[PDB]
């Protein structure tokens, strides 16, 4: 869509290139199909990952948490709020400097048209703008 928050425009690329792409897969989820990828802490008496031997993978923890200012920020430099009514946009009227709107999936075509018309006149960014309404 190629849009950016004006307050961060000259900084956003540093921020984006700085985000981690680490994944914390569950131990041995690569060995048997019955174990999903979702993280669970290992609790075995012998387990090599719990005991932190070199060569085993890394475990999650507080050290990896991002700085408080950068956290929750989308790649366009805004935070997101969910909307499903015309009367929802009315809340964003004070916050449009830092927040943007994302219309919920279940809202149908006829109603979406009414949301977008209101978004234009109030000056609010909607990130699902194209959505289903491309046809």
Partner 1 sequence: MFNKKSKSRKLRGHVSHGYGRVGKHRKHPAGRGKSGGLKHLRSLFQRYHPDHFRKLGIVMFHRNKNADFTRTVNVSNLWGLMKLEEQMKFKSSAEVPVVDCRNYGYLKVLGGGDLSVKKPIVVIARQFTKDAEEKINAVGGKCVVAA
Q: Which is nearer to RNA, 48 or 118 (CB)?
A: 48
76 in Cβ contact with 97 (< 8 Å): no
Q: Which is nearer to RNA, 18 or 57 (CB)?
A: 57
State the Cα angle at 11 between 130 and 22, rounded to 5°: 75
Q: Which is nearer to partner 1, 42 or 131 (CB)?
A: 42
36 in Cβ contact with 26 (< 8 Å): yes
Regarding 58 and contact with RNA (CB under 7 A), the answer is yes
User: In sequence order, what are the beta bridge partners of 79?
Assistant: 99
Residue 131 interacts with, from RNA, K ion, partner 1, none (CB under 5-8 Å by kind) = none
H or E element, residue 89: helix 86-89
Token pair for 133: 């309404």
How many residues touch RNA under the rule CB under 7 A: the total is: 22
Regarding 43 and contact with partner 1 (CB under 8 A), the answer is yes
**Could you list the residues that contact partner 1 (CB under 8 A)?**
40-41, 43
**Could you list the residues that contact K ion (CB under 5 A)?**
45
């Amino acid at each position: 869509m190629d849009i950016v928050n004006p307050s961060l425009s000259k900084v956003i690329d540093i921020i984006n290139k700085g985000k981690s792409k680490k994944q914390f897969k569950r131990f041995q989820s690569w060995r048997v199909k019955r174990v999903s990828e979702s993280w669970r802490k290992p609790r075995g008496i012998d387990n090599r990952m719990r005991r932190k031997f070199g060569g085993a993978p890394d475990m999650p923890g507080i050290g990896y948490k991002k700085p408080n200012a950068i956290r929750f920020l989308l790649p366009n430099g805004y935070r997101k709020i969910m909307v499903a009514c015309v009367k929802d946009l009315e809340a964003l009227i004070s916050l449009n400097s830092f927040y943007c709107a994302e219309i919920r999936h279940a809202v149908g075509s006829k109603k979406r048209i009414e949301i977008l018309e209101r978004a234009e006149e109030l000056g609010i960014l909607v990130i699902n703008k194209e959505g289903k309404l491309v046809k």
